[PDB]
Amino acid sequence: NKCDVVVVGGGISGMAAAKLLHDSGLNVVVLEARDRVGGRTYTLRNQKVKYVDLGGSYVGPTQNRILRLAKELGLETYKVNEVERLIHHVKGKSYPFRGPFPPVWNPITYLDHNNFWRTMDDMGREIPSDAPWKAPLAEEWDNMTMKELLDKLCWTESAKQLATLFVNLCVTAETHEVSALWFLWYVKQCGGTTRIISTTNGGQERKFVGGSGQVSERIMDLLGDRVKLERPVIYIDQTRENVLVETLNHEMYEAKYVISAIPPTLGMKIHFNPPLPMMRNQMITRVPLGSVIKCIVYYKEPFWRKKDYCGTMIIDGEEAPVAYTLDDTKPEGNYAAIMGFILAHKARKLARLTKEERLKKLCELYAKVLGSLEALEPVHYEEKNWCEEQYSGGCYTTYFPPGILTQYGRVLRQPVDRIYFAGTETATHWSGYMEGAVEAGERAAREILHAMGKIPEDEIWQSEPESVDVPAQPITTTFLERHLPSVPGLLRLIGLTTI
Amino acid sequence: NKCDVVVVGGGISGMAAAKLLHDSGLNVVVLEARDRVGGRTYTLRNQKVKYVDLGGSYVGPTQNRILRLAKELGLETYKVNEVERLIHHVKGKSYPFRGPFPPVWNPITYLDHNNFWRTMDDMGREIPSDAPWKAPLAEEWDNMTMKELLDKLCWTESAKQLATLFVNLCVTAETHEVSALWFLWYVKQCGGTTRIISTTNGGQERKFVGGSGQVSERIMDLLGDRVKLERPVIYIDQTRENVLVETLNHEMYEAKYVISAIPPTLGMKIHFNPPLPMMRNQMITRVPLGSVIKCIVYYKEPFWRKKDYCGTMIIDGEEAPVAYTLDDTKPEGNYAAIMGFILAHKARKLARLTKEERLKKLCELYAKVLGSLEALEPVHYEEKNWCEEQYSGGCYTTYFPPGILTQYGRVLRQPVDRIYFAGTETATHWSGYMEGAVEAGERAAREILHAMGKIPEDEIWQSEPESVDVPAQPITTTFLERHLPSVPGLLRLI
Ligand SMILES: *[C]C1=C([C])[C]=C2C(=[C]1)N([C][C]([O])[C]([O])[C]([O])[C]OP([O])(=O)OP([O])(=O)O[C][C]1O[C](N3[C]=NC4=C3N=[C]N=C4[N])[C]([O])[C]1[O])C1=NC(=O)[N]C(=O)C1=N2[C][C]C1=[C][C]=[C][C]=[C]1
Ligand SMILES: *[C]C1=C([C])[C]=C2C(=[C]1)N([C][C]([O])[C]([O])[C]([O])[C]OP([O])(=O)OP([O])(=O)O[C][C]1O[C](N3[C]=NC4=C3N=[C]N=C4[N])[C]([O])[C]1[O])C1=NC(=O)[N]C(=O)C1=N2[C][C]C1=[C][C]=[C][C]=[C]1
Numbered sequence: 001n002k003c004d005v006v007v008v009g010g011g012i013s014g015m016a017a018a019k020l021l022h023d024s025g026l027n028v029v030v031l032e033a034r035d036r037v038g039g040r041t042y043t044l045r046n047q048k049v050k051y052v053d054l055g056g057s058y059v060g061p062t063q064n065r066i067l068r069l070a071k072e073l074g075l076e077t078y079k080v081n082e083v084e085r086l087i088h089h090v091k092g093k094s095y096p097f098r099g100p101f102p103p104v105w106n107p108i109t110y111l112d113h114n115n116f117w118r119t120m121d122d123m124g125r126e127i128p129s130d131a132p133w134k135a136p137l138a139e140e141w142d143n144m145t146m147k148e149l150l151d152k153l154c155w156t157e158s159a160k161q162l163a164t165l166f167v168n169l170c171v172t173a174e175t176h177e178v179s180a181l182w183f184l185w186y187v188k189q190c191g192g193t194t195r196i197i198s199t200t201n202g203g204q205e206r207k208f209v210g211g212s213g214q215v216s217e218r219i220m221d222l223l224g225d226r227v228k229l230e231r232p233v234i235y236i237d238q239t240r241e242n243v244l245v246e247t248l249n250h251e252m253y254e255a256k257y258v259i260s261a262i263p264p265t266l267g268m269k270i271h272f273n274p275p276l277p278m279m280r281n282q283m284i285t286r287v288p289l290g291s292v293i294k295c296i297v298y299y300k301e302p303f304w305r306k307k308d309y310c311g312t313m314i315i316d317g318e319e320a321p322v323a324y325t326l327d328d329t330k331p332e333g334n335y336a337a338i339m340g341f342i343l344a345h346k347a348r349k350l351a352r353l354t355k356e357e358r359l360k361k362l363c364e365l366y367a368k369v370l371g372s373l374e375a376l377e378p379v380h381y382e383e384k385n386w387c388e389e390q391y392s393g394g395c396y397t398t399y400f401p402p403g404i405l406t407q408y409g410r411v412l413r414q415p416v417d418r419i420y421f422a423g424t425e426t427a428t429h430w431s432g433y434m435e436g437a438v439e440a441g442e443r444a445a446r447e448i449l450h451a452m453g454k455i456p457e458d459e460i461w462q463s464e465p466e467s468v469d470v471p472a473q474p475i476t477t478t479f480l481e482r483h484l485p486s487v488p489g490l491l492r493l494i495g496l497t498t499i
Numbered sequence: 500n501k502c503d504v505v506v507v508g509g510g511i512s513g514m515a516a517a518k519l520l521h522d523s524g525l526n527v528v529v530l531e532a533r534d535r536v537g538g539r540t541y542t543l544r545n546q547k548v549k550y551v552d553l554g555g556s557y558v559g560p561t562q563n564r565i566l567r568l569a570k571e572l573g574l575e576t577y578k579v580n581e582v583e584r585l586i587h588h589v590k591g592k593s594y595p596f597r598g599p600f601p602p603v604w605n606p607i608t609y610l611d612h613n614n615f616w617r618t619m620d621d622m623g624r625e626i627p628s629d630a631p632w633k634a635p636l637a638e639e640w641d642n643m644t645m646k647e648l649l650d651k652l653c654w655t656e657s658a659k660q661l662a663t664l665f666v667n668l669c670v671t672a673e674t675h676e677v678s679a680l681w682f683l684w685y686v687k688q689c690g691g692t693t694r695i696i697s698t699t700n701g702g703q704e705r706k707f708v709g710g711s712g713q714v715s716e717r718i719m720d721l722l723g724d725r726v727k728l729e730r731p732v733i734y735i736d737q738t739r740e741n742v743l744v745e746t747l748n749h750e751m752y753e754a755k756y757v758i759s760a761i762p763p764t765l766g767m768k769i770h771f772n773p774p775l776p777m778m779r780n781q782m783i784t785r786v787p788l789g790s791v792i793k794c795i796v797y798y799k800e801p802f803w804r805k806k807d808y809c810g811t812m813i814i815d816g817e818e819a820p821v822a823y824t825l826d827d828t829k830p831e832g833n834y835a836a837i838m839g840f841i842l843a844h845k846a847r848k849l850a851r852l853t854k855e856e857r858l859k860k861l862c863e864l865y866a867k868v869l870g871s872l873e874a875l876e877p878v879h880y881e882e883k884n885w886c887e888e889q890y891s892g893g894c895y896t897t898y899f900p901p902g903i904l905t906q907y908g909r910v911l912r913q914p915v916d917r918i919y920f921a922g923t924e925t926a927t928h929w930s931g932y933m934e935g936a937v938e939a940g941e942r943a944a945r946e947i948l949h950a951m952g953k954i955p956e957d958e959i960w961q962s963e964p965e966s967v968d969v970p971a972q973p974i975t976t977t978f979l980e981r982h983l984p985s986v987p988g989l990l991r992l993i
Contacts, residue, residue: 143646143675145901176642177902232770234733235747248734248770250749265784268767271731271747271889278850278887285764285892288784348906351777388777390770393784401900402644403676407847 003027005448006245006255008233008270011039012056012434013422014261015219016069016441022223024449029253030223031245033232033391037220040392041434043211044382050335051211052296052328054384055395056434057339059212060198060205061472062191063435064464065442066215070208073218077206077470081302081327082199084310089369090161091317100198102314104158108487112156115486116163117193118477119153124188129428132185133409141181142406149180155487161316168343169324170196171432172290173399177344182400190430194475199312201473203433204326212434232391237273238417257448261422261441263289263393264412280416283408286401287425289394291387293342293351295322297362298380302329302336304370311338313369321350321361338366351385358383397432398425413440420444502526504947505744505754507732507769510538511555511933512921513760514718515568515940521722523948528752529722530744532731532890536719539891540933542712543881549834550710551827553793553883554894555933556838558711559697559704560971561690562934563963564941565714569707572717576705576969580801580826581698583809588868589660590816599697601813603657607986611655614985615662616692617976618652623687629927631684632908640680641905648679654986660815667842668823669695670931671789672898676843681899689929693974698811700972702932703825711933731890736772737916756947760921760940762788762892763911775915782907785900786924788893790886792841792850794821796861797879801828801835803869810837812868820849820860837865850884857882896931897924912939917950919943 005021007014010032021028036042041056059066059077067077088095088102097103104110127135135141141149146167154160167175167183190196196203208214220227228247235246236258245253260267267276267284275281304311304327311327322340329336340362342350350358359381367375386395400409413426422444427436446462449455466472485493502525506517509531520527535541540555558565558576566576587594587601596602603612626634634640640648645666653659666674670685689695695702707713719726727746734745735757744752759766766775766783774780803810803826810826821839828835839861841849849857858880866874885894899908912925921943926935945961948954965971984992 143673145644147642148647174642174902177900234770265767268764268784269770271733271768275887275889278884279847281889282787282790282886282893285767285784285787288781291781345906348778385777387781388774390774390780394781401676403673407844 001252002254003029004255005029005257005259006031006243006253007259007261008245009033009039009261009423010037010216010220010227010229011261011423011437012041012066012215013424013437013441014259015216016438017259017261017422017445018223018226019219020442020445021448022226024454028223028226029255030227031231031233031247031253032227032229035230037216037227037229038213039216040386040395041212041216042384043213048380049296049298049337049382050330052337052382053207053211053213054294054382055386056212057207058204059207059434059470060203061201061467061470062195063203063430063433064467065438066433066435067467067470068464069438070215071469073215075214075218076209078209078331079206080199080204081305081329082310082312084305084308086312087309087314087369089313089315089320094369094371096309100194100200100202102162109156109158111484111490112154112159112487113162114481114484115489116153116159118481120184120187121192123184124192127181127185127188129185129189131410132181133406135181138181138406141184142179142404143402144180145176145402146178146180146183147174147176150175165314165316165323166197169341171399172292172341172343172347172394172396174344177399177401179400179402179405182405185405186432189428190433192475199326206470209331215434233270235271235273236419238419239273243418256418257451258419259422259441259444259448260419261444263423264398264425265289266391266393276416279408279411280414283411286404286408287398288401289392289398290396291344291347292395293347293358293383293385293387295340295342295358295362295383296328296381297338297340297359297366297378299336299338299374299377300379302327302333303372303374307370307372309370313366315365315369320365321346321358322365325366347385347387351387355381355383413444415447420447500751501753502528503754504528504756504758505530505742505752506758506760507744508532508538508760508922509536509715509719509726509728510760510922510936511540511565511714512923512936512940513758514715515937516758516760516921516944517722517725518718519941519944520947521725523953527722527725528754529726530730530732530746530752531726531728534729536715536726536728537712538715539885539894540711540715541883542710547879548795548797548836548881549829551795551881552706552710552712553881554711554885556706556711557703558707558933558969559702560700560966560969561694562702562929562932562969563966564937565932565934566966566969567963568937569714570968572714574713574717575708577708577830578705579698579703580828581809581811583804583807585811586808586813586868588812588814588819593868593870595808599693599699599701601661605657608655608657610983610989611653611658611986612661613980613983614988615652615658617980619683619686620691622683623691626680626684626687628684628688630909631680632905634680637680637905640683641678642901643679644675644901645677645679645682646673646675649674664813664815664822665696668840670898671791671840671842671846671893671895673843676898676900678899678901678904681904684904685931688927689932691974698825705969708830714933732769734770734772735918737918738772742917755917756950757918758921758940758943758947759918760943762922763897763924764788764892765890778907778910779913779915782910785903785907786897787900788891788897789895790843790846791894792846792857792882792884792886793838794841794857794861794882795827795836795838795880796858796865796877798835798837798873798876799878801826801832802871802873803837806869806871808869812865814864814868819864820845820857821864824865846884846886850886854880854882912943914946919946
């Protein structure tokens with residue numbers, strides 16, 4: 001029954017909020033729909049894999065809140081393998097490369113590729129992280145899909161193909177599904193194109209030893225009996241003096257405040273009294289999550305390293321079930337594994353197959369890409385289709401279709417009376433990640449602390465000191481990168497001379 | 500507790516389904532979230548207006564199922580006033596006209612307007628009503644917004660402005676919000692552009708005497724205590740032999756079958772055991788409803804008629820709160836009124852104002868458009884913002900954003916075990932309308948009848964005889980309309 005704050009959702013965001021509130025002396029309850037905590041992070045343990053993250057996993061430089069939280073919980077990180085060559089597989093052929101970006105040799109194509117990534121970052125700088133709808137050209141950009149933006153910008157198919165894969169990979173959605181404004185915001189608030197795509201010095205640099213699930217599990221340990229599993233919230237009543245929160249299993253909780261730490265659209269699973277205000281009412285019907293199957297194929301040995309491949313593959317083409325892989329071998333060098341994502345429409349398409357059929361398709365792909373028969377001899381397989389999850393709605397995160405972010409964006413974390421909104425979707429830095437979950441959970445907690453008069457207003461949003469264990473190298477550009485012309489720029493420069 | 504079929508939702512579709520099942524001898528319960536039936540139809544009665552439809556209202560030729568159901572319930576229709584001239588207000592000026600379509604005088608503009616409408620209908624003929632995702636170019640068209648389509652097709656701003664208003668009006672959504680495939684399916688399955696926009700001989704020909712709310716009220720009368728108001732469904736359990744349906748007010752219902760007769764996304768308000776299959780699980784997060792405020796301004800007299808205006812206004816431009824109006828005067832000629840829609844982003848924008856502020860803006864607009872100071876003296880005002888409705892999610896209906904209909908469309912009315920899907924969104928003819936609600940309710944009911952072995956498979960989908968009271972005239976084109984070139988065509992020919 002009675003407490004100071006009910007937290008709805010025991011994912012990282014909700015657990016981070018509950019921890020903060022608990023540490024400040026408030027009585028908190030966490031109401032979690034599932035028989036486990038973690039939400040879109042999930043670590044499976046069995047003897048065959050030891051442990052494996054089937055949801056969120058990667059952390060890297062500039063993600064200082066998750067890093068600090070995890071380190072306080074007694075967790076260690078290790079570096080994803082990127083020692084050997086990366087592979088870009090395109091038109092049925094593999095092109096090994098070192099460094100973050102695949103090399104482009106054709107000078108026209110090179111100009112086009114260079115201008116695309118640069119323009120994405122240029123457009124990002126016009127977009128406030130905390131209020132993307134305030135971008136000078138917010139409406140124009142929001143009324144376009146990423147597909148239309150790619151069609152305008154990319155004068156080569158090669159740049160368009162790669163850009164498309166980049167969007168599919170970052171947001172598990174098709175270019176034609178997502179607002180251009182939203183996707184440009186999303187990249188910018190992760191620190192730009194380089195930071196979002198890099199392993200070394202980027203978002204995918206590291207994983208946690210033992211799994212990211214330990215973040216939520218260990219916060220549950222600290223909170224003890226305050227976390228209620230198999231308590232899906234069905235009803236929130238704010239008509240009276242104390243907020244009443246009812247669960248499916250027929251329990252009632254009474255609190256001063258509520259933190260909603262679930263994906264925005266899953267707000268739909270709750271009946272509200274009084275009804276939600278108009279904008280939120282409609283917003284929660286407008287904000288789907290992407291589609292992904294995360295797949296891990298185990299091998300006796302990390303045999304790709306012997307061929308001087310790190311295990312990173314960037315795989316273009318409709319026929320490839322998986323467009324992106326990372327080496328998922330343990331830091332001890334055992335439980336050799338390739339992690340791959342089945343993205344967007346392919347997650348829909350290939351979900352129809354059996355587990356064994358998908359295993360076969362992935363091995364046959366890896367064998368081709370790696371040029372190795374050994375890829376055809378897996379010792380184990382694990383996968384997770386996030387599309388089927390009633391209490392996530394998909395992964396990694398919520399995308400915004402055209403028109404939505406400018407019309408409804410400002411309401412995402414706007415408090416509804418005594419309900420405050422956490423969840424990674426409401427973050428301003430690495431929204432979509434475990435990092436953004438921590439930011440949003442802790443900020444929603446502090447919004448409540450301020451409402452109770454416990455902290456000043458200027459303390460709701462708190463800066464995070466940089467990790468000493470995972471420091472960030474700055475993102476640099478070259479002179480040529482900055483000033484080389486686009487394709488139309490080159491053409492104009494030919495027109496001008498030849499006149 | 501126990502019955503043969505629980506129907507979730509007491510709108511027209513749910514009521515039509517429940518009536519059919521009840522008439523066949525089954526024990527049915529209707530579980531309705533609100534303290535009323537009707538859903539997206541709602542008839543308000545007070546002494547000032549007598550009655551007014553604040554939701555769905557219009558019916559017309561080819562809508563034979565709603566016409567038959569309403570007639571059986573003892574309802575009468577009357578004709579929306581279209582005797583006098585229509586008005587097209589563009590660039591701050593009024594151009595009165597007769598006929599459904601506002602005239603175009605610039606020659607290039609004429610060719611561009613003509614080709615736009617004709618192209619929309621041409622494209623629609625390649626789209627199966629029952630399976631739009633089977634269109635030859637389904638993906639190509641689905642991966643584009645209507646905004647992109649309009650940008651490609653319309654060589655003039657004039658055609659693009661009118662096309663844009665047309666989209667905003669039909670689906671209460673912005674051209675950039677909606678799939679081209681879905682919008683073209685939507686128009687096609689209402690019989691084409693002419694049928695969907697026409698008053699005379701179209702969707703807006705008629706209203707019901709006394710209100711459309713009587714449809715659901717009268718079926719509730721027939722069903723007696725079988726309709727449960729203020730019973731929002733929160734939980735559906737299909738793990739055991741009988742289906743268990745739980746409500747918010749803590750009641751349990753047990754049945755052999757369930758009909759879901761709510762908007763697809765409102766399926767989210769229900770917790771399912773076992774979880775929904777993957778495609779439906781995601782589909783219901785992907786299918787919003789549009790945004791509209793329906794507004795009715797009352798006047799002492801239908802003064803527009805004296806100026807030879809019927810009350811239909813087609814109003815272009817950003818500054819106009821309302822883009823479209825119809826005369827809402829009673830058939831007796833009293834309770835003189837103009838009905839207007841505040842559409843899409845304007846519903847979001849203007850919702851912030853007070854009721855009186857919106858009244859003032861509409862009156863000043865109508866005074867301008869009708870050219871009458873009399874528009875400045877309303878005697879009464881009623882309005883309804885559908886965006887605020889927890890148990891509708893918006894109006895008129897569900898739209899599909901780019902990519903959704905091809906990926907998830909085929910799952911809309913696919914049964915989940917013992918749950919069958921009604922609601923206007925699942926119809927194949929006038930989906931989005933009261934007509935579609937009846938089609939889908941009756942079809943979902945008959946799917947269950949067949950699951951029970953009561954009827955043969957070929958009887959799930961039943962044709963409807965044409966109304967003798969509201970017969971349809973065919974949609975005709977002229978030789979020149981068919982064969983006149985587009986703007987690019989004229990250029991190529993040069
Ligand atoms: C899925 C996924 C995958 C596959 C992958 C990935 C991911 C994911 N990511 C993301 C993450 O994970 C996220 O962001 C997080 O986790 C989130 O958090 P939050 O905010 O907390 O949320 P969630 O988890 O979901 O939680 C919630 C909760 O709640 C609950 N509920 C619901 N409903 C309800 C409830 N309760 C009560 N009542 C009601 N009604 C649920 O159950 C839950 O629990 C990520 N991230 C990071 O950071 N990293 C990584 O790695 C990741 N991943 C990926 C991404 C990428 C990769 C590569 C490239 C690019 C990108
Ligand atoms: C809103 C509107 C407006 C403003 C206008 C209009 C309309 C609308 N429309 C449409 C109609 O109305 C529709 O379609 C119908 O109504 C539908 O039906 P249905 O399918 O049945 O559905 P609904 O109604 O929604 O119902 C449902 C129910 O359910 C319930 N719920 C929910 N949830 C739940 C429940 N229950 C239990 N549980 C749970 N959870 C609810 O509450 C309800 O009741 C229309 N239509 C026609 O036909 N006509 C007309 O007029 C109309 N309108 C318009 C359109 C137009 C105009 C002009 C131009 C163009 C177009």
